[PDB]
């Protein structure tokens with residue numbers, strides 16, 4: 100099974116001012132002359148990690164990675180002002196011009212696949228190929244499954260904790276209920292809800308439980324992760340339609356793509372990958388048996404490495 104390339108430092112980085120109150124962190128890694136690529140992290144509000152650099156051949160790829168508005172090293176931290184899908188799409192173009200790339204490969208998993216599609220459908224001309232994982236299209240059915248009733252039936256003992264702070268009436272709409280707490284004037288109230296919401300996801304993203312899931316509880320990370328995720332979901336990803344992303348696939352069918360999705364991905368159901376593949380015949384679909392949601396699930400990682408090497412030779 101293929102694994103990550105060895106660790107390496109970014110050869111350059113900085114902060115880009117959006118002009119509307121955001122200074123977003125970015126970093127360039129790999130080969131300054133290599134094939135251009137951009138990494139879209141998940142969440143939203145997930146942030147990048149040094150390991151994401153190791154997802155591409157160090158000598159064949161010029162990888163630009165960045166923290167989306169409000170998370171990671173991007174300032175202001177946990178900010179919900181001017182934080183929408185369309186601003187992020189704008190930011191990607193901005194970052195593209197700066198790095199001086201004419202066209203690049205878009206790599207994105209989970210929310211990253213969502214923003215990748217929105218971006219690709221908005222600027223088809225700028226995408227050479229796409230490597231998508233754990234498809235998430237933001238349909239209400241997708242949000243209901245993960246935050247109202249669905250995954251809850253596979254992890255009832257964990258879902259009981261998420262509901263613990265809610266009154267019986269609030270339980271009918273968990274997203275809305277958490278939205279109030281996450282936007283409370285009391286930071287202690289915000290953090291309590293933020294931790295619960297983040298750990299729920301941290302513990303259901305892998306096939307088997309891992310200690311790693313506890314890092315989703317760190318105050319600063321949890322706070323921005325929850326606020327931003329909940330923000331985007333509260334507004335249905337800022338899409339015109341429930342199925343806008345599937346409805347506009349015609350605009351990118353001509354683009355080479357690979358779709359990797361764990362059979363037992365509990366955050367995003369395989370159904371999403373199947374629906375996408377049905378509308379996108381050209382795309383190469385890979386349903387990884389025995390795998391969960393996370394990019395580092397042995398079987399999912401294997402297909403991603405093979406996918407990136409393939410597009411680079």
Ligand SMILES: CNCC(=O)c1nnc(C(C)(C)C)o1
Nearest residue numbers: 141142143208209210393394
């Ligand atoms: C509903 N939130 C799922 C999501 O977009 C997400 N959370 N973590 C990830 C990565 C696997 C990309 C780290 O994606």
